[model samples]
Target: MRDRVRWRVLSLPPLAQWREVMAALEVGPEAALAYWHRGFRRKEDLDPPLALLPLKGLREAAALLEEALRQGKRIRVHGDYDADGLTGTAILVRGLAALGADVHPFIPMERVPEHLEASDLFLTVDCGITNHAELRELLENGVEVIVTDHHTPGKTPPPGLVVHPALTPDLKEKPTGAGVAFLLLWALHERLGLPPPLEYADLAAVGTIADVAPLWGWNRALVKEGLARIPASSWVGLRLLAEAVGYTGKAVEVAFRIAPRINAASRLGEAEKALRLLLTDDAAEAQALVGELHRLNARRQTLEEAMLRKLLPQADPEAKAIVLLDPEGHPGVMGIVASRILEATLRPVFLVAQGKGTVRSLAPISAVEALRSAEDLLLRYGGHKEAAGFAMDEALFPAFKARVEAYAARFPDPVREVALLDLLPEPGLLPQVFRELALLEPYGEGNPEPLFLLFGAPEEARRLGEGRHLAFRLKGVRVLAWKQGDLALPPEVEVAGLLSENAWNGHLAYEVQAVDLRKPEALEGGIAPFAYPLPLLEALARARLGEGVYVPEDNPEGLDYAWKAGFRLLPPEEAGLWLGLPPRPVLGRRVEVALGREARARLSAPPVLHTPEARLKALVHRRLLFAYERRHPGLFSEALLAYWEVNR
Candidate 1:
């Protein structure tokens, strides 16, 4: 009877901007409202995204470029491998091309890597900024270089025209690497009126959104405009691919569908295909390329499924963290595939593939804290938080595994655990609540969807469709669920799962897909706290209940009640024993109360001497309410009302 967990509800932006996202299309209220939400704006209170750029870096770069053009000098463009890098390259290329400079593209291949080598002046779009050796090589070669990128910088920029938003001592983080390129574009546009054509705005938008860039400031504004253009865009290849993936006419339809296809092509080491599709005017060639890439996406899906299928059986709860091995995983696809697998399982998935004598792994979330614990065993490993990849001599996996297991065991618990607040929820208001929740769009690692605790859920929950996914209505409104097998519901209580929508589903409705289960302690013990199953007791306290003290006195009313009932109170030494307690000492007697096993367990004893049944029942009601009050500090009165109605 604790007060329900309350999240700071977020409000989504307005709708009228996306005329394509009409209310008539019932992609659930959240999707519909989101699609129709208003255009995004730069938050005035926060530093403008421009603040990330060096104060006069863009102007300096431009002035230098103009001088170079006047002086008839050659400039080389260097870029990296990811989608953001490609788009950033494109933005810079387009900008420079419009100004009529002698610029040439230099993309590094796996086997044939390119640095800022041998150019009169090299303009590094995304990669060279963070590559220490490359930066040094360029500067030492007497080749002046200009680096514009968003990667975390090396300790020092190459002694050249280095430009980045993140390294701006006081500048906060913004979206993808292209943010740097966007700076170049904006400066050029302001200086020479060379606006980057709107056609490629969608490309930048897709990359930024897909990369999980912060949806604020310039990113928010750009994506807002890009999504607005989605419905009637002339980007035929992007549109056709979206249709192939069963997503049509939504702002982010292409984000999931078309974006991934493009990314899939890059994963297969054919990023040029994506660039060609985005930049080409030839519809026929675009169609052919997109078709082939679509098939590649199909292949990506098959490979990913194969990897996950192979890994799922080996995923043990006892395993410190999940570490999957795919000796045949393609180098390019491994990271993306590993990320997907990690998302599904919420464990760090380390995918490896054959390369030289080493097996490189793409690790998400798990590798940081857990894998780092095993770092001494690794040949080489470094990456961002929540997502990392490593390499090691294949023979060392045993040692690495042992160390990782120990490291994985040490993760600290979170402040809150999954909580159930409802025995039965009124279905009508759920739609509105869910819609309000969607205001905090783009849920992912850092910005997670608020998890609500529901009580009294049904025993069994199943997924019905081909993928065991459903987007429809049981009664009304709309709900969505993924993988029917993922739905493990308890049989007795009324079931309620977190509801999310698939925008591709045009017809609006609700579907009940269960994710977790909730149940009362016993039909007998009626409302005593029960610890979760073994091996997870500490986790339950640390992660879910916000670091509860393990002592018997921590929850005293419940503790006293537990003692009065018939259960063992686990002090540090006796915890998890599931044994009987010592005999009660002394004078005080209790009004005999009939409580459940969970309640009995809390107090550490069984009912022995009874005063009167009627008197005991009265004492219990009062004691139970008081315990509820203590557990939840703010809502004693409302708690009483809710309990009275529930019991009544």
Candidate 2:
């Protein structure tokens, strides 16, 4: 929301190529949407699928269930507490109950924990394949078990029967829990010669989108179909739940709202609540459950925000990456926090916290890889790339943090540079361009709208907005700054960012959402034009600065003077050396920062001295003085001093 927000094009393949792939598949207009979802999103990013197709595993597992039903065997359905787990539970509960099997659900809960048990056959849905101990215990108890899930393997299960995407590398990985259920159910539907079940598809899409699965290939088609199926959706509980979320239209938005309620219930050890909603046929009962979910969601949101607020300030900038595990932070909200932090900082973030006896971490993927293999990293790691959930022992937090950080370091600090798509793109062609871009629907992570660079001829420029965001007009072209926080801008700038269609007053037009703007020279080496450090880091820079400092905020690429001269951002510890300042102790107890090398030599020889961080703090001081004093002249002295005061 603030300007200077850093973005790295996950920089996957182009959309043009994706369209060709879809055309080869021979679909129609819906094909365009399908193509963007399945073929266009990142397909090769996931680990190999474990099952030939989950259908194979499902059929085998279902045949076993049918045998038990024919013989009147006792059955226990086990599931985890989460969207995927709950959806899978719904699949089996509704499917078996419809089959008249003596099936009862056994979901784990913090309050009333249930361990694996020997039954006629324990069907594990949305959980298992990595649960070595649980699987072994069930097998030893003489309980035949079949596991169906989509999570990455944590450890190999005892060899009798297990089906998960991680086992079959050749098959398409079913990244969502609902996808796993869909695959198995699709197999079952084939056996019955019936149309595929639509109930789970809608739930799958909710899980997929909320889980942030890349809308590509199979997943895209699934969610797209799910949206179409929503209004006519047969799931009574999900329908009532959607109404609670104020859903009137727009399947995609409804999916987001409903997914959280389901996820929220599960997070609170009420996964059965979600399963009940998915399975219940009674309208009155469904509405009552939806209200309960709504209340749980409110509690989830409050706890999440409070946790984020406390963890935010404790963040250390020197850290290459972040891994926070607050005991008080809800285990279920770790995924959300990790996602929020990753978005805010553009860094891989892992948010974990203790819950009961387990520790949960939301894996990260973007420019940074916070996870290595799905196995070994999580006791239960599931979901698509970009976002995932995995729980482990609380004792493993330190090791987990180290492993994640080391894995992420392998990825280069992404080469970030503003690409100028079309500077002053002709208005006549604007509509067509936007339409083509929209063809690449559901842009996030692997896919993003292409950004543009605009250079207009000299024109009038003035600061606007309460935040004094800069607005400029040149050659009949107008651009405005939306993310600029405290950054100063030149009279005019070389703006670089994503171009979005802005609708206003019955008019629709395109405008640039500025990412960064620095002086032209800052675009050197094709590096991103500007780099906006975190607010905390920026504050540190300002505090340590001396007099005559002109701290230009977001206009790194458009800072006509300093950027052209090759100035770059440095951390607090390195600021002294970056500015070529001589390190001298102030008052024999404080750190004294002199200017850059040449300036330091001069200053040390001439010996201009000042108080340390303590003395500077005592005074209403502002700015960090840089040797660029001669380069920037008198204009920067006040700003520079102000920067140092705030940073220190």
Candidate 3:
């Protein structure tokens, strides 16, 4: 219920215009309208121009690979540990081997050497953009290099045929690491008169989504086409991994479930395991690899949670950037922790664990720029605008932190301006809203799921899922506000949430997946809180309430009195006629009321006097009381009869 969020609204389209858009795109009306609502205009925009082929160095790289294959030269596909790297490596290795190439995959580990002494050629995927010195050394050692990476390039290109988006500006769209590798394979297939290896698209899809590539232009088509094939993928390993992780072929599933598991193996220094999982054709081997990844991911989660618990208490509120240096902190989880801290604080963070330092940042503040400002204090550092990693001396931690803070001070405060709206559709339009959204499948970084706004007095605000979540009825639609069970909700609340369909026990219904909640003042045309005079409720004996009255901690003495009067201490949001001090307006009820002087003083105090989370606590449980009365009209009769009996 924090008032920190700023909402933006993407207005809904008219039905006639929706039909026109749908016809033009040759798509369903609902989906067409949704895509248009999401800011798409032209029909062709749905399918971005392809850059999967005719990349600048694609032909040259393909020819070089072909020559190496014909010459029986030992070739190594050097890949990173993340999903992008693993999937890109799989694409290249599988495609090349299909074309009769002698190629093998290798991922760098802590104990691994840099120089490729055994391999004649090195094809690096998802990395090598900033590894100029290493690539130079390998070139000097007579190793031919073909770099296919998606990362932003450094000042100078590596010493080889580089197939990357930064170098191929002529192309209509930028290709990710997997896309570049896929392009090379496509070119090779065309040159050798072999059919396009469509199977590689599966890997390309996972890698592109995992890397958070912009899902527009060619990438949109790449991902859209790739997602359809993943469910029935030709690769046993992919199918098994999907089944193990419960992937429904959604791009987000790849990013959260599949990517993290693959990354866990690499983050924990087991990159080979992930690579093998992707490359293995045996079903047994795939299952074992999936199991290993799950175990690794679980351990990673345990370490990550522990690390966050340790770091959060020490996080500085006044500092421009979060700089936490823990010599004993787990290096494997530092990146994850940095990301978590960045989300929580909405600030760029610099974390140093073991001998490594990592930076995570959101837009407007660049981690690469911040790291560059403190480069002198580090042994080596490299990363893109938002995420980066480096190595530094433990002794240089304080100096490095000072420089980072200095750089960060120049940046403005973190203000997340998101889309907001207050469109309360009639009950009939809910299904259309849900159906239209399905056309824009695979929502991710570039294309996020739409967040709609709901405004009404909450009816039934109660805890669900074993008290892990908060649920309420707004406008007769069940709106679930997650992880807000402890926080009190307002009686008149405005919720910013995504519309989702819930299927439980063969019953399907549309529900709002609430992201944040706030006061409904904006919806009511900017009215002040408590615009009307407060009501006084006097408890009646034998109230026979539809639900019990809740006693808040702010009024413990009131709880004592109510309990002694045979009034049980009730959970919040239960319908009842009795209470100590009314925290929020009582909806759907009219009875003689009264409040103690002390309780009234406490209730009318400024919100600043309360905890940040508790500022809106008074509004939480009122809806539950309201909902119970609406659901069971018979209870109201019983309450009325008891009231008359008590009075008589």
Candidate 4:
């Protein structure tokens, strides 16, 4: 079956840098190329020392904490609703408490009044930058506030001290809310001669990965260390949650399993449960909280999918940017729904309901930047590049929608959901490649798990997990496809997936998890091969257009001897004699080969515009071929573009 994603193999950089990287890491060409593909010039770049900037107002902030601990004063780590906020709250409560400060965690979840309870210091994590009035009130009530966060700041600064990456000019890398919280603690501990609180790194990892923060520099170091320390964690809640979810400390496990469970509590309006779960030392309490989290997560998924099913049909799949109004949309799952819409349409999406909205966009189609275009219309809006949230008057929806759509139209290029190939897998070298990938681990935003392309007929095939999933034995590797039990494949197949080792019942076994699989097909059926008439060919021959008459490399079009003579083949734009066909009708020349006129007409015909995937691929390839050149453009590049005109 044809897949919706574009399959693009990343190209290799120069050999000098390639060898240098290989020598530095003692890795093979495939692994080295994967590193280079991600712009890692050196091994040290992968594992740099944890990045920490000299946060402003640190001296005064540290002094206040020290004085609070000295006096046994009441301190609260105010938490937001998401995983980042929850984890950051836990970090502050635990770290300060260990330092002999009487610290507590408060999860307000926008009912900011609860955090107003008497306290000497009210430290906000993952939030507070936007709660200017909340901070001001806490100050009036004699609470000193310290905001540790990593969101876009409003023009109005906080009422109290702020510790944020964006506020510090020296910070080369950005951190999540948890990162900000953890860094402040690390700095305080360093100055006070207390040992660095490495114990809290796992929670930081959970929040960072959960928040989808860029895993580079400081973020990477902490997550790598955190993933390693998770099993040995002293926090009873996190340890049990890990066991309950079977997290195995992998970054992906946190993103898929642990983070969602933690986030679920908040999404379902039980934000305090997540905060309590992270800070609770009681094992049974943690276990009960985990149960509730699981239930909430299941509900979250159900509602999320229901909303998705309702909104997708309403979205214009052909539109570059989609604005959807789900009157019955779940406020909790709008962000998740917007993200899912991005996956389906591969387009920037804004899902709004009532006066609230969530935005998800791909790179270069920034969510925050798009929101900035309509800033005047928004009441409260904040987020990073890929995801953002905003609130506005429902009456202003049409104007906000038009502005974002116009901003999207500014970059009219198509967004591709591609199956990116890290390497062309050779069965003999599979083990080595898997081993080398470890150096790049604890993958997240900047660095991702390497996706390899495995090609072959399956040695054997069967359904596993009682037929809910599919399995194929390719060479000695067992390739597993989840929920793909119904997919049948031909002998010669191409599978793009991740190869990793799994720990099962005290034994370690390497396995392949297929992301995409399909039987490879030639360009013939995909690209329409229409032979030019004898009269047209003779006319081209007379015009001296062809030492190289354009011939289809993938289809058996029996047209010319371009291959045999090494003839100068014509490009799609210049080809006077058309063999196969083009995405659009040849502007100056006839593309007829027999009744190929109708076939060529169908290629650019208005009817193709109705098909979603076909139209997207056409737009994608059109943008790709705009300023790029390729060898045998007519045979390969143009052929691929034409193929999309027919593919579903």
Candidate 5:
């Protein structure tokens, strides 16, 4: 492991406060405590309801749509390629087809001028907010255009009626493109004296979660209802997808398994295949389409792994921002690569491929704001703060890069926060805690699953799952580590993971699903300032006269002064005098345990180190791990220790 991470434990509530919360909410002890830990003070916060907000043009957009249906005009639902766009298109097309409208789903990910000309009434879902000129040209040509999107509008909004959450100022809810479409569908049905089109809430939920819309307000209720509808969904494709992915109706299953497949179809330039997958009613067609999507998702994985392999080595750790221009880079995968790079460097990342750029940034450095600072150089750009995209002349990359770096430099370093819900519970309470954690379900962008800190070595460590995963049997519970089989864990560890339970078995076995694991820690009160002894100073004096010394590459403090003092610093590859601690096992024949100052790192334990992910948490696996002494060198937090300046 080459990096370190910080774990912020959201301290638990007191006994008196938890008791009051439990009684007031009529929930279990653990659920009440967890709610308080997540800062849920209001009882309403615990059970979010279906919040419906009036969009800027829901009524007008619904009227136009109804006119199109009544006139039997050629109506097309132009959608995006991502899961959000595909599902949003599905929701609208299905709802409209039910209402006797001549409607079809059209997912021209890029631009399709032919289809644009064929439509009498064009409605867009998940996209179309930025197509001001196109919408204007179509309206002038006597074709109707309605935009049902959720992306933040540009300085100039599109020229037609748009049903978007952002159009309503000070919008509290973060609705996905599909959510907007669902709302539009609900409005039209309401006008028809029908109930809400909640049967399609399943697609809305998939789109909302896939787009990573904040899981608060109406989004919470939307997803909760959507998940409940998945098992019995009227759509054959969705039901097939759920069955194939073993999705038993959880937000996480949809987010990780279902959404990626839907997104993969578009990433590989087959958005229509996925769109049809959602629209198809034939069981055979749905099966083949879903299977093709799984294949596409697998291919996406292959492409991403290859892209990261090529991009990571070129990443600069010291740069305030990362800008890599790989002309041959896959345009579809650049956004994913940008996000991965951001996780490792904890800096804003901008990846350009053949003139199209995708951006992902940590907080304190808004990716969109960075793009705005260099907006003049770009052809077009838009997105939320954290993630964005743009198009620019490839020749302008040098200037665009410098400007982005400069903008990012203005912000302080972004903090890598890992908020823990509770510390390790006692052996018997692990099950209770695990069960209570489910009560806080439907975790998504805003409301997330809680992580706990378990302090102790999980014994019986061995590689399982074909050596791709790790299994450990601890005193209090069992622990499973996915994709960290190579870690040489110590006997004692501070395991940070989420509590999980497998319920299908006759008896529920609660276990820890490891997020990030590290060796025992106490760096807060553990650091000690040390200096070289007199004898060591004398040894250094003599060493200046041609004595061979070996300094670890990571320990620049020792090597820098010695280089000017005439000491011949030998590479660890050759036999030489070793100083302090080696970052890894070295070939040095001689050792000096004392040279530079040593931060206590611990009160008394010997210097040793090791560490080991779930995803989105797993994306930071390399950065979060700290295989100390063996590789990283100490238990001192990298965030605290990387900045330590030794006395000269």
Candidate 6:
């Protein structure tokens, strides 16, 4: 079957709404349209008070915290090892400790019942939604338990003040575990006449984003407000963690870099390390914890890849559901593996480790419901509709697998759709489009980054990262299509992708991260390839007429022609032009010319208005300025302009 992506186009707002949004949010046209589409209307929408949340157990949970603080009770914060739980634990620990409450965090490898003992008060974060028996056991032992979780509850919810999203029928924006914990703390601080725990907002934001919560209303405000505080955060550990991950203070960075590191600590059986990194005030301690988490994440990536390599080829394509079992497999990484399998096969997958299974389901099928049908054969299971977990008897695995397959058979074909914001825009409008799209920052579940459809003839696409990624070029643009390294690119293709900025070595450029690609024939109208004008090419060549040139190993013929044209062969950094097919971004600005295809069809209205000679001069001037700014540290070198002029 031909590999393709199902594209979904959202309805565009009216021009008046777009202009109004632009003025209100002080954003560009695309950003304004996107915000309006995502329902960002009033200015207050950006920072709506937490008071708006119809949180059911907010007062009760606050009261419990207040009593615990007054009695000087030993509060145990039970959290899961995942990023959501870890951040939640961090938020509560920091907020309570700042108020002088005696509290600590605990994460169990198994059920809460196995970990909890005698405690003054036990508060669960991101967990305890389904542990009715354990909650009862704690209550029977005279322990005060407060459940603050976001996961869907089982048949009988745990006793006591359980602050979950489902409890609030009127609240459309559901907060994550950290957000829940933060709201409770904020309320307690308010009742106590203490300043709100604004310091914990960053923690809440991390958890909310890491958990893939909808970035709409409350969650959007939380992420936006919290991400603002990350760079100069009050917590020393956050500063150190940011440095460790080379964070540019973007919310997306937290999801990809920070969250993974924190979660890795727990996934690698070192949850406390992540907790310490988040909670510690000591700079040295935080540094040590961050280092440990970094190493653990690397270890996790290695192990996950190895497991996938071993499992993928052995998969049964005809099976209704993939039921993989391996006693020696790492339990922590099974969910990730199952997710990878589901993405590749578009089928429900169950990866079992030591009799415990982590399930991942594609669209049109619910993993929770499938497992629910076979609940009689399983020990326990509870999770979201698409993802869930269960621990079953090893001896009954065959029977359970059969039942799961039968249940999965009810929904065979999964419907997958990729959302696209627009077809390719005019090349000149790219800068405006990129800037506008950025205003809708911290894009996640409810507010995803805009994906664009790009049509072009493949100039030359090559494998990168040892065949784990593809480095593609088309119409003077560079694209890094990750994980599609093994797939062959057609001569003419339409790419569905998001535009991303690449800032390396003090230079900035935009590149595409292709979500999917297909032949031009796949789409109606058979879109025309992006045509690079001959004048533009001549201008580019004229600007580098007397400069040094570098040719890649693949461009032996180009090197001969460049030498004949009086171009000196120089090192990469000194070269003015990288006249090579499918140019590398390493050459920076010059890659634009090299990647442009010969003029196949011209745009009706080209953006450039200057003469070819004048355009070439202007281009050279811009390159010189960029080179001087990047290479120089404090001030421009006295000889910079003169040197560039000589080269020109």
Most accurate candidate by lDDT: 5
Tell me the whole-model lDDT of each prediction, alpha carbons only.
0.50, 0.54, 0.69, 0.70, 0.72, 0.70
Residue runs of model 1 more than 4 Å from their true location after superposition? 1-56, 68-72, 109-118, 140-142, 194-199, 231-255, 340-346, 355-379, 412-648
Model 4 lDDT per residue over 491-572, tens place: 6776778886778999967778887776753211111223233333443453354443454443433333444545456665
Candidate number with greatest TM-score = 3
List runs of model 5 lying over 4 Å from the truth: 1-4, 11-17, 37-47, 109-117, 135-139, 169-171, 375-377, 395-403, 457-475, 482-492, 503-506, 522-648
Between prediction 1 and prediction 2, the one with superior TM-score is 1
**TM-score of each model, paired residue for residue:** 0.64, 0.61, 0.75, 0.72, 0.74, 0.75
Using TM-score as the measure, name the better of candidate 1 and candidate 3: 3
Residue range 543-596, candidate 1, lDDT tens digits: 233332222344455555445553434443324322222122111211111222
Q: Which of 2 and 5 is the better model by lDDT?
A: 5
Query: How many residue pairs in model 5 have overlapping backbones?
Result: 3
| Candidate 2 C-alpha RMSD relative to the actual structure | 17.0
lDDT of 3 by residue, 1-648 (tens): 133346654333443564467567555433453577665657677666544456778789888988898898888888877788888889989988876878888877232245456588888897887777675545456788888887878788877888877777666576788877887888888888888767788888888888888877778878887877888887887888888878877888888888888889988888888888888889899889889999999999999998899997776575678999888888989998998787777778889988898999875788888988878778988887889999998898888888888888897766665664324344555675567567676687667877666777887778766765788888888888765435567667777888888899999898888887767533211111111212223333333232355555666666666667666556433534444334444444533232333553224323333222121221112212221223223332232222222223
Q: Candidate 5 has what TM-score?
A: 0.74
Model 2 per-residue lDDT tens digits across residues 93-129: 6766666778887777232114343367677776766
Clashes of each: 44, 67, 16, 1, 3, 0
> For model 5, how does the per-residue alpha-carbon lDDT over 277-307 read when each residue is reduced to its tens digit?
8888998999999989989899989989998
Point out the worst 10-residue segment of candidate 3 by lDDT: 524-533
Q: Answer with 3 or 6, whichever has the higher lDDT.
A: 6
Residue runs of model 6 more than 4 Å from their true location after superposition: 1-4, 15-19, 26-29, 43-54, 109-118, 135-142, 155-157, 316-319, 460-478, 482-491, 504-506, 521-648
